[PDB]
Amino acid sequence: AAVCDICGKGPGFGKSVSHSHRRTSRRWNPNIQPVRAVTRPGGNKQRINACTSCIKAGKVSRA
Amino acid sequence: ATITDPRDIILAPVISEKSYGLIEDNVYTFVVHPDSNKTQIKIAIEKIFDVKVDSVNTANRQGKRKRTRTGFGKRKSTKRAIVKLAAGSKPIDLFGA
RNA sequence: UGUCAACCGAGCGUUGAUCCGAGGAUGUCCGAAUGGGGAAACCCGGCACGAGUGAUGUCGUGUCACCAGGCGCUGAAUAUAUAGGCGUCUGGGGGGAACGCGGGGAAGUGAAACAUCUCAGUACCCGUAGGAAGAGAAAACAAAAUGUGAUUCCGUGAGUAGUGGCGAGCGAAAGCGGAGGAUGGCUAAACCGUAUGCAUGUGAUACCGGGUAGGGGUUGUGUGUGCGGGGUUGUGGGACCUAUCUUUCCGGCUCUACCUGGCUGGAGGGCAGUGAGAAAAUGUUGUGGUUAGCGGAAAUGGCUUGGGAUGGCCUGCCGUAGACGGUGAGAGCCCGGUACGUGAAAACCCGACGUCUGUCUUGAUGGUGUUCCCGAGUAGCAGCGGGCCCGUGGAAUCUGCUGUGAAUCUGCCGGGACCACCCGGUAAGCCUGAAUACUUCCCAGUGACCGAUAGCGGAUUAGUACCGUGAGGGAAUGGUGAAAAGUACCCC
RNA sequence: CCUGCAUCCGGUGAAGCCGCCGAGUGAUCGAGUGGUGGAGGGUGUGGGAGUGAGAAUGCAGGCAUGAGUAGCGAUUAGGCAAGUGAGAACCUUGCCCGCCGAAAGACCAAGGGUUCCUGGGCCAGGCCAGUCCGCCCAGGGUGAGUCGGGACCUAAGGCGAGGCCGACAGGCGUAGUCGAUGGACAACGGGUUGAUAUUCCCGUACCCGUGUAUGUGCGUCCAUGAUGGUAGUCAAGCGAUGGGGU
RNA sequence: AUAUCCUGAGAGGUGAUGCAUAGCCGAGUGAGGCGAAUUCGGUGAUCCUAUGCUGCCGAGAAAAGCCUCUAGCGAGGACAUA
Ligand SMILES: [Mg+2]
Ligand SMILES: [Mg+2]
Ligand SMILES: [Mg+2]
Ligand SMILES: [Mg+2]
Ligand SMILES: [Mg+2]
Ligand SMILES: [Mg+2]
Ligand SMILES: [Mg+2]
Ligand SMILES: [Mg+2]
Ligand SMILES: [Mg+2]
Ligand SMILES: [Mg+2]
Ligand SMILES: [Mg+2]
Ligand SMILES: [Mg+2]
Ligand SMILES: [Mg+2]
Ligand SMILES: [Mg+2]
Ligand SMILES: [Mg+2]
Ligand SMILES: [Mg+2]
Ligand SMILES: [Mg+2]
Ligand SMILES: [Mg+2]
Ligand SMILES: [Mg+2]
Ligand SMILES: [Mg+2]
Ligand SMILES: [Mg+2]
Ligand SMILES: [Mg+2]
Ligand SMILES: [Mg+2]
Ligand SMILES: [Mg+2]
Ligand SMILES: [Mg+2]
Ligand SMILES: [Mg+2]
Ligand SMILES: [Mg+2]
Ligand SMILES: [Mg+2]
Ligand SMILES: [Mg+2]
Ligand SMILES: [Mg+2]
Ligand SMILES: [Mg+2]
Ligand SMILES: [Mg+2]
Ligand SMILES: [Mg+2]
Ligand SMILES: [Mg+2]
Ligand SMILES: [Mg+2]
Ligand SMILES: [Mg+2]
Ligand SMILES: [Mg+2]
Ligand SMILES: [Mg+2]
Ligand SMILES: [Mg+2]
Ligand SMILES: [Mg+2]
Ligand SMILES: [Mg+2]
Ligand SMILES: [Mg+2]
Ligand SMILES: [Mg+2]
Ligand SMILES: [Mg+2]
Ligand SMILES: [Mg+2]
Ligand SMILES: [Mg+2]
Ligand SMILES: [Mg+2]
Ligand SMILES: [Mg+2]
Ligand SMILES: [Mg+2]
Ligand SMILES: [Mg+2]
Ligand SMILES: [Mg+2]
Ligand SMILES: [Mg+2]
Ligand SMILES: [Mg+2]
Ligand SMILES: [Mg+2]
Ligand SMILES: [Mg+2]
Ligand SMILES: [Mg+2]
Ligand SMILES: [Mg+2]
Ligand SMILES: [Mg+2]
Ligand SMILES: [Mg+2]
Ligand SMILES: [Mg+2]
Ligand SMILES: [Mg+2]
Ligand SMILES: [Mg+2]
Ligand SMILES: [Mg+2]
Ligand SMILES: [Mg+2]
Ligand SMILES: [Mg+2]
Ligand SMILES: [Mg+2]
Ligand SMILES: [Mg+2]
Ligand SMILES: [Mg+2]
Ligand SMILES: [Mg+2]
Ligand SMILES: [Zn+2]
Structure with missing residues (x-):
């Protein structure tokens, strides 16, 4: 739950602000889920972490 | 290339009253290289002095x-x-x- | 025949010692440690070739990690095939004082308190290479001037325009003047060829510019991929037809033989070359400098005090050399050397002079109307955060994440919301030296800087003794005299 | 005090220190004189200061009183004759007395490294003097097929090829290899020098390996046998990285 | 069945015509030589049989080695003596 193995999108770091205008540390992590990639026509897939961006763009096929 | 000789292990003799007594009783005491061995001493001494040796010891x-x-x-x-x-x-x- | 620090015994040298300059071998063990093992410098092996004993026991020289990337073989449950397994080559594991790039990232303290702020993007950490790095060829400014023209670094522009519990504080840009010259080059798209596959075929009147004609595969027609031409831009450009001008020879092809228009090979003549624009090697110069050395001028002057003249008085000489040190007391002419001249076996690097490599001349020049192209989850939009003076405020621009999601030249984006008219430009791919930053080391120089409680903690046994089981802390100790001639000898 | 400039002094004695004699309204001065010394100084006018001490329970070094006062670190206690030498209650010899004796004795492992012996002396140390020493100097001294460890095996635990997870840094744990306080494993009595002893010697034992010779002696090549009875295997001898006991 | 096997204290013989010692001679920092007897009773263990036996529950390491089995190699190997 860190980075997409394909596009390598790492998490970004920022500062969270309360309604009292006081600052504090917080982190944002890109949406990535475990899916079996469709790359070989042979009909075999392997467990690889992927990101919604790559999945929806189809860089790893759906089948 | 290097040449191995049995005369490069024993260093020097030691002179003392105990050594003289052991000589009287026909026993000698040599100084030997720190990394040598009892078999080294025996083989080398017998080869060099062409005299049969019974036993050796180290300390x-x-x-x-x-x-x-x-x-x-x-x-x-x-x-x-x-x-x-x-x-x-x-x-x-x-x-x- | 190094040194602390005398002393003895031993020896070499005119047949060139010692010394210094360049290159070359050996180089026990630990230390990324990598034959295996482990509490640093200590224990135990395999394999091959040699040495030794009547044979084991023994000994010498090689070789015996892991990971990643190529290449070859092999193909499990399981069939296609994969994972996995073997053989062989190429690379990497650590260290370094400062200098850079991208991230993470704190608390003391001011506001006479303090949450926002500031301290500060500081200390520290992480991943990273170099001798420098990064950045870089406008989707840039300005405003009706017919302006500038890549980037970087300094000085102004000003403590002003702004911002802030409008407190404490924080802080630009444009333009202008300087250092440098390369206002440089590459790459995917529009279309033909070629190894292919996936396909399907009316498998025959379609593939080839016209005419004579032979046939049914340069597949008849589509798709994705590797390989060579033609193109690289803003007054838009590039691909197709249509006229004009056309600065070597020959061959094979445009299915085929014959004329017309195109594709490709073999030979002049230019073009550059270690180069960012393509890469590899091989044949002949600079008293270019550097790593040592060598030459190098003139008073034993006289008189005086003196232990000692390098002190005082009087006479000389050199000066392309009166910088600086030593010598028994302040030395141009005593010594070391200074001005100046020379000078290298080997090696270094620079520059210049020579085989070889490769694009183009099958090609270039100025026009015309039509059909296709100009960098995809991108631009923009909505939500949540950063840093620009802008501390969400109307919020421009850049950027991180999540959803939605566009077009190809009367297209698109920019001139601090936004609309209309004007003006500039062509992002979503990649390289690029010169102007700049720094010294752990070496060479040469300087001090209206310190002289032993000062000066680096360290002028001597120095990061030693010592303290602490640890990170760590951290001490004081120079002057005899010209030479030791360091007081023979006698006496208590 | 250091400096630019122009001057003067100095082995016929320059700088500090200790006196005498004097002098200015002050911080002080003396090119006025005496002893010590041996190597650089003064005046005039400019420029620059780490430029002026008595106190912060300041710091480095040296030294005052209390002071020749307290103590001289137990629960046993010494005395005598002789010797050594300059020195003796504290050293050596001999004779009495006392104390300890589940230790105030004889040993192992851990712990220190030369304290062990021989020879030299007593400016450093021993709470006093020392001929003495756990002071120092110079030399010498440590002997295992069988004792303790390694080459044999393992635990609580550590490392960790692959791998999982994690923004990076990093946390886990498989196969394996490390890790005695355990398991198995083969020697006892006596003598010996100034220092070594299940180690050397004497006497007698035990456990693994290699070579030669000899005797039992069994097969490969013949072939009886047992068979499952022409033919095909075989039970010799080794025997596990495997199974089962212990 | 004290059948058979294993184990096994203690006793007995061997090791030992050896070694050592009380003592006797000379000989003194000390060495040398010679060298007797060595039978019977009591007491009695915290040591052996003993990883025994009897009771109790809170219910009590692994590997290696040794024996055996085949799988599998196999024509020289096993035993004894020197
Ligand atoms: Mg990730
Ligand atoms: Mg940040
Ligand atoms: Mg904060
Ligand atoms: Mg050299
Ligand atoms: Mg070598
Ligand atoms: Mg290693
Ligand atoms: Mg290792
Ligand atoms: Mg590879
Ligand atoms: Mg398959
Ligand atoms: Mg590195
Ligand atoms: Mg306040
Ligand atoms: Mg406050
Ligand atoms: Mg700031
Ligand atoms: Mg570099
Ligand atoms: Mg650039
Ligand atoms: Mg850029
Ligand atoms: Mg400004
Ligand atoms: Mg202020
Ligand atoms: Mg092309
Ligand atoms: Mg192109
Ligand atoms: Mg004189
Ligand atoms: Mg003179
Ligand atoms: Mg001078
Ligand atoms: Mg001199
Ligand atoms: Mg001088
Ligand atoms: Mg000279
Ligand atoms: Mg703001
Ligand atoms: Mg805003
Ligand atoms: Mg406007
Ligand atoms: Mg224009
Ligand atoms: Mg563009
Ligand atoms: Mg620069
Ligand atoms: Mg002084
Ligand atoms: Mg310590
Ligand atoms: Mg002075
Ligand atoms: Mg003078
Ligand atoms: Mg004088
Ligand atoms: Mg005098
Ligand atoms: Mg003097
Ligand atoms: Mg002046
Ligand atoms: Mg002044
Ligand atoms: Mg001033
Ligand atoms: Mg000051
Ligand atoms: Mg004072
Ligand atoms: Mg004090
Ligand atoms: Mg006092
Ligand atoms: Mg008193
Ligand atoms: Mg008293
Ligand atoms: Mg005491
Ligand atoms: Mg006495
Ligand atoms: Mg007692
Ligand atoms: Mg008792
Ligand atoms: Mg007791
Ligand atoms: Mg211990
Ligand atoms: Mg020890
Ligand atoms: Mg002693
Ligand atoms: Mg002594
Ligand atoms: Mg004394
Ligand atoms: Mg003392
Ligand atoms: Mg010492
Ligand atoms: Mg001593
Ligand atoms: Mg031994
Ligand atoms: Mg493990
Ligand atoms: Mg690993
Ligand atoms: Mg692990
Ligand atoms: Mg271990
Ligand atoms: Mg152990
Ligand atoms: Mg012993
Ligand atoms: Mg009992
Ligand atoms: Zn992705």
């Missing part, structure tokens, strides 16, 4: 520690061996008493 002692106004120093550490000649009893003249 080592730590170096002394002397004072110096500069600081503290240590002498060298030596390993010495004991050789008992066989019944042949061929005296060695090179020792020179």
Whole structure:
């Protein structure tokens, strides 16, 4: 739950602000889920972490 | 290339009252290289002095520690061996008493 | 025949010692440690070739990690095939005082308190290479001037325009003047060829510019990929037809033989070359400098005090050399050397002079109307955060994440919301030296800087003794005199 | 005090220190004189200061009183004759007395490294003097097929090829290899020098390996046998990285 | 069945015509030589049989080695003596 193995999108770091205008540390992590990639026509897939961006763009096929 | 010789392991003799007594009883005491072995001593000595040898023994002692106004120093550490000649009893003249 | 620091015994040298300059071998063990093991410098092996014993026991020289990337063989449950397994080559594991790039990232303290702020993007950490790095060829400014023209670094522009519990504080840009010259080059798209596959075929009147004609495969027609031409831009450009001008020879092809228009090979003549624009090697110069050395001028002057003249008085000489040190007391002419000249076996690097490599001349020049192209989850939009003076405020621009999601030249984006009219430009791919930053080391120089409680903690046994089981802390100790001639000898 | 400039002094004695004699309204001065010394100084006018001490329970070094006062670190206690030497209650010899003796004795492992012996002396140390020493100097001294460890095996635990997870840094744990306080494993009595002893010697034992010779002696090549009875295997001898006991 | 096997204290013989010692001679920092008897009773263990036996529950390491089995190699190997 860190980075997409394909596009390598790492998490970004920022500062969270309360309604009292006081600052504090917080982190944002890109949406990535475990899916079996469709790359070989042979009909075999392997467990690889992927990101919604790559999945929806189809860089790893759906089948 | 290097040349191995059985005469490069034994270093020097030791002169003392105990050594003289052991010589009287036909036993000699040599100084041997720290990394040598009893088999080394036996094979080398028999080969060089063409005299049958019965048994060998080895012993080592730590170096002394002397004072110096500069600081503290240590002498060298030596390993010495004991050789008992066989019944042949061929005296060695090179020792020179 | 190094040195602390005398003393003895031993020896070499005119047949060139010692010394210094360049290159070359050996180089025990630990230390990324990598034959295996482990509490640093200590224990135990395999294999091959040699040495030794009547044979084991023994000994010498090689070789015996891991990971990643190529290449070859092999193909499990399981069939296609994969994972996995073997053989062989190429690379990497650590260290370094400062200098850079991208991230993470704190608390003391001011506001006479303090949450926002500031301290500060500081200390520290992480991943990273170099001798420098990064950045870089406008989707840039300005405003009716017919302006500038890549980037970087300094000085102004000003403590002003702004911002802030409008407190404490924080802080630009444009323009202008300087250092440098390369206002440089590459790459995917529009279309033909070629190794292919996936396909299907009316498998025959379609593939080839016209005419004579032979046939049914340069597949008849589509798709994705590797390989060579033609193109690289803003007054838009590039691909197709249509006229004009056309600065070597020959061959094979445009299915085929014959004329017309195109594709490709073999030979002049230019073009450059270690180069960013393509890469590899091989044949002949600079008293270019550097790593040592060598030459190098003139008073034993006289008189005086003196232990000692390098002190005082009087006479000389050199000066392309009166910088600086030593010598028994302040020395141009005593010594070391200074001005100046020379000078290298080997090696270094620079520059210049020579085989070889490769694009183009099958090609270039100025026009015309029509059909296709100009960098995809991108631009923009909505939500949540950063840093620009802008501390969400109307919020421009850049950027991180999540959803939605566009077009190809009367297209698109920019001139601090936004609309209309004007003006500039062509992002979503990649390289690029010169102007700049720094010294752990070496060479040469300087001090209205310190002289032993000062000066680096360290002028001597120095990061030693010592303290602490640890990170760590951290001491004081120079002057005899010209030479030791260091007081023979006698006496208590 | 250091400096630019122009001057003067100095082995016929320059700088500090200790006196005498004097002098200015002050911080002080003396090119006025005496002893010590041996190597650089003064005046005039400019420029620059780490430029002026008595106190912060300041710091480095040296030294005052209490002071020749307290103590001289137990629960046993010494005395005598002789010797050594300059020195003796504290050293050596001999004779009495006392104390300890589940230790105030004889040993192992851990712990220190030369304190062990021989020879030299007593400016440093021993709470006093020392001929003495756990002071120092110079030399010498440590002997294992069988004792303790390694080459044999393992635990609580550590490392960790692959791998999982994690923004990076990093946390886990498989196969394996490390890790005695355990398991198995083969020697006892006596003598010996100034220092070594299940180690050397004497006497007698035990456990693994290699070579030669000899005797039992069994098969490969013949072939009886047992068979499952022409033919095909075989039970010799080794025997596990595997199974089962212990 | 004290059948058979294993184990096994203690006793007995061997090791030992050897070694050592009370003592006797000379000989003194000390060495040398010679060298007797060595039978019977009591007491009695915290040591052996003993990883025994009897009771109790809170219910009590692994590997290696040794024996055996085949799988599998196999024509020289096993035993004894020197
Ligand atoms: Mg990730
Ligand atoms: Mg940040
Ligand atoms: Mg904060
Ligand atoms: Mg010492
Ligand atoms: Mg050299
Ligand atoms: Mg070598
Ligand atoms: Mg290694
Ligand atoms: Mg290792
Ligand atoms: Mg590879
Ligand atoms: Mg398959
Ligand atoms: Mg590195
Ligand atoms: Mg306040
Ligand atoms: Mg406050
Ligand atoms: Mg700031
Ligand atoms: Mg570099
Ligand atoms: Mg650039
Ligand atoms: Mg860029
Ligand atoms: Mg400004
Ligand atoms: Mg202020
Ligand atoms: Mg092309
Ligand atoms: Mg192109
Ligand atoms: Mg004189
Ligand atoms: Mg003179
Ligand atoms: Mg001078
Ligand atoms: Mg001189
Ligand atoms: Mg001088
Ligand atoms: Mg000279
Ligand atoms: Mg703001
Ligand atoms: Mg805003
Ligand atoms: Mg406007
Ligand atoms: Mg225009
Ligand atoms: Mg563009
Ligand atoms: Mg620069
Ligand atoms: Mg002084
Ligand atoms: Mg410590
Ligand atoms: Mg002065
Ligand atoms: Mg003078
Ligand atoms: Mg004088
Ligand atoms: Mg005088
Ligand atoms: Mg003097
Ligand atoms: Mg002046
Ligand atoms: Mg002044
Ligand atoms: Mg000033
Ligand atoms: Mg000051
Ligand atoms: Mg004072
Ligand atoms: Mg004090
Ligand atoms: Mg007092
Ligand atoms: Mg008193
Ligand atoms: Mg008293
Ligand atoms: Mg006491
Ligand atoms: Mg006495
Ligand atoms: Mg008692
Ligand atoms: Mg008792
Ligand atoms: Mg007691
Ligand atoms: Mg211990
Ligand atoms: Mg020890
Ligand atoms: Mg002693
Ligand atoms: Mg003594
Ligand atoms: Mg004394
Ligand atoms: Mg003392
Ligand atoms: Mg001593
Ligand atoms: Mg031994
Ligand atoms: Mg493990
Ligand atoms: Mg690993
Ligand atoms: Mg692990
Ligand atoms: Mg271990
Ligand atoms: Mg153990
Ligand atoms: Mg012993
Ligand atoms: Mg009992
Ligand atoms: Zn992705």
